[PDB]
TrEMBL record, chain A:
Residues reported in the UniProt entry to bind glutathione 2: 62, 81, 125
EC number: 2.5.1.18
Stretches assigned to the GST N-terminal domain: 13-96
Name of the featured protein: glutathione transferase
Organism: Aspergillus fumigatus (strain CBS 144.89 / FGSC A1163 / CEA10)
EC top class, as a word: transferase
Gene Ontology MF terms in the entry: glutathione transferase activity; molecular function activator activity
Superkingdom of the source species: Eukaryota
Amino acid sequence: ERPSDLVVNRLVLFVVKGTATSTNNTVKPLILLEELGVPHDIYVVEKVSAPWFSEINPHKMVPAILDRSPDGRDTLRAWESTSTLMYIADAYDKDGTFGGRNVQERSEINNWLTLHTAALGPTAKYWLYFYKLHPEKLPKTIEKLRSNITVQYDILERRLNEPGQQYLALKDRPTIADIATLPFAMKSTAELFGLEFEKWPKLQEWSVRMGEREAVKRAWQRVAGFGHGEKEYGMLE
Amino acid sequence: ERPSDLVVNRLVLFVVKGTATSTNNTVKPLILLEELGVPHDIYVVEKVSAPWFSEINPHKMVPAILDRSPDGRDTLRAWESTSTLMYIADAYDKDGTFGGRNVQERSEINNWLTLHTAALGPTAKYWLYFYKLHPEKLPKTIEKLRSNITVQYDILERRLNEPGQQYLALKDRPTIADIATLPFAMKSTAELFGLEFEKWPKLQEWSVRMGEREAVKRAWQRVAGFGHGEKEYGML
């Protein structure tokens, strides 16, 4: 039972109204879409609890993607921020600029992408849940999760102090690993966790380097603005 | 400083001595290796805190993989159980039996693989940490993680209640998504969580369906035997 304005004529990225807390995952696919210049629409979901949405993403969160298959026979879906980067890379990164060009590049890209998807990503998600969203305060839990984030930063800092290692996965250029990691390893997010981001210098330098890319800047401007235009919810134009 | 017996002639899988609790992630790549018939060696790591091992996996955990590059010039590494599954698929699953043959198959495979990697996987790990390993016991934290596990089992159950959906990602066959999920979605794990696995019948039927496969049974039998043979540690 789909809304009237939801049509998949191309890649549709499902987001929510842009706030300080809401954009950290939805920006990831948006960065890669801007990097490759993939033609896409933005659907701002009013309620992720709406039954029509759980059909797209059964976990009932954003970002989510609908896009018709290469042959046009079926409608593809991608949900979980890591899964949306992997789909966009697969479908639109022809030369593997962000997805990797051979087995050697992909081995590292998947190591560092997966590290974020399994460690920093969920730890930071659980930190924020118990910090704000949980009905009671559990500071012993919150302290241990904060302590685990410093161990993730330690591992990222270690990697970026290896010779000529400008980016997490590859030495030469950024990848879906770097895009997936950035929003949980930059000064604004470090300050939210109550950490001094200066304690991991090569990680901070890397965060600034990624931040100065135009595709990242554009993604940050756009994701903040979604649902503050005259049309608040639904497909945007 | 590398150990003497650590030579990379083929794919080397890093494991620890088999117990009930130290095999749930190392079995994942071992299942895929058995499925595809990939030539490999087993290196039983005595201590994952060893400096030489953190040069392979900086997370200081098993499973990890060292392999030769396809050209044979260099040495690759794969760490985290999900990345080991992606590497093995990338390098050896050329026809895409478990990795997916087209964008559409890989869209759903990566969806259900990542759901495990991002949700049930970390949730289960954090439940187990606070439940056993944490110095103090935090019941409200333990109860909330267990509650999130039940929500994950709900999502898996719903998907397996869809018409003809015999496996999580694809209707027709099991993929790396199914392998990554199986160890955290079977009765023994449900028993451990304190849950009646009979509550999710379609998920239970799936767990049995996966458990019956030859490669899954060989993998479980091997991962329980590692470091209980003639050689306790190092290359077998």
